[PDB]
Symmetry: C3
Subunit: 186 residues, 3 copies
């Protein structure tokens, strides 16, 4: 009913984690479901390169995904980590965007606006079965990368362990992280 905006359930490599790299090195599953005045979100990232799939050979690691949308809620693929636009399940996608009233854009470097953040946790299950917490930070709007952009949504997964989940290459998977935010008018 128009109510789902997503990457599909099992997307091909569509996302770039590694700075400078020219083609997707990861698979971002992102699902945004419109429900009343909020969006319910579901996001998981799967590695698809040796670089991404060896990140957890280190104890401290940060993975950033930046999504920038235009005025009609379509991805700007050049600047975004995600290189393919989201699609509706069943035209404008403005109504899935984060509210600029609840999560306003602010003056670039003036004060602090922690009103624009969602924090949470998901996990990485290592090849030996050990489960490591990943701290999740979602930033909504707040700040523009350029003057072409109308909406912002960034994800940061952060691991800080006494130990490195891995000593070898292993398929990176962030366990599903769910979240909700106040959506813009349709």
């Amino acid at each position: 009913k128009n109510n789902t905006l997503w990457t599909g359930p099992k997307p091909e490599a569509n996302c770039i984690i590694e700075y400078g790299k020219q083609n997707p090195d990861s698979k971002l599953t992102l699902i945004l479901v419109k429900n009343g005045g909020i969006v319910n979100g579901y996001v998981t990232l799967m590695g698809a390169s040796d670089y991404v799939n060896t990140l957890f050979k280190n104890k401290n690691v940060s993975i950033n995904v930046e999504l920038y949308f235009d005025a009609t809620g379509h991805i700007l693929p050049d600047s975004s980590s995600l290189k393919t636009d989201l699609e509706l399940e069943y035209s404008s996608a403005r109504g899935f965007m984060p509210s600029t009233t609840a999560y306003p854009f602010v003056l670039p470097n003036a004060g602090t606006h922690n009103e624009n953040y969602i924090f949470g946790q998901c996990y990485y299950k290592a090849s030996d079965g050990a489960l490591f917490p990943l701290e999740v930070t979602v930033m909504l709007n707040k700040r523009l990368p350029d003057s072409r952009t109308s909406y912002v949504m960034t994800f940061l997964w952060s691991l800080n362990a006494g130990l490195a989940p891995e000593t070898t290459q292993a398929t990176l998977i962030t366990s599903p992280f769910t979240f909700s935010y106040i959506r813009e008018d349709d």
Copy 2:
């Protein structure tokens, strides 16, 4: 229509400080009907020097109490929240209330009464950028405060840290907490 809320960016509407006379904080609360459950979203922002200095202590508790009449309208005299919720689609808000079958009222006896509680976690980001977990307790119904009340929803954010997050005044903001509960019939 299927959303009952305070709006996305409410003016000070909630009293934290005991004895205080007018709102000292901004409560954002959004309740969305989703089949037989409600999906909830809640965050609290400080709007007074008292609230905005609580995090100078390492152990803090913040209580918000909401009491609703038989048609799911706030009772402002007894509730922490002094302005009623409104529907996005401008009748009864009964269908948004926590089920008295799932979350019963019981005799005022000491006890854990676990069935009436939802536990979870949200966060406070301090001025220095440090992230503090806040333990969240949601109580549904369980204890009637008087003969005027038909539904109860209370929130507690607890901080118990080894170090206080702040040494100075800073805008208190609870990162968004989401939860779901079984709702009453419309």
Copy 3:
């Protein structure tokens, strides 16, 4: 209609103690169809001395396995839940996607949701319970078309309880990609 569930306050309908003949617990499971996903809500309540004494130990693992047929109905012989879910109205559309979460023959960890809920002990102490949800992945038989398993784990320095007390897992919410209607 858009809700598939046990109901809000079910009678004993679930078996936790392996080999036991009848329900020893009350599983509340609520699955709401929301666009391309299901939003789930699950809590377990003990209803036997065995279940209600588990938390006298520091290490506790509670497992529930749900096996569904092709039209999304519980297989009670093999499932921990002995009564089928009901619509508030085929429930295939409520089932976990075999595209997102495929069955496989034996590393494959995309089939897991991890999280936390809690147990409040009689003395008021709050204990976190580590939650693992597994979707499909392992096919036990030919009668089964979808799998949904829950594991609640406590590993504590100390035991929530010295005596019998009603086991209640605080509500755990989760979301997964659903199969086509």
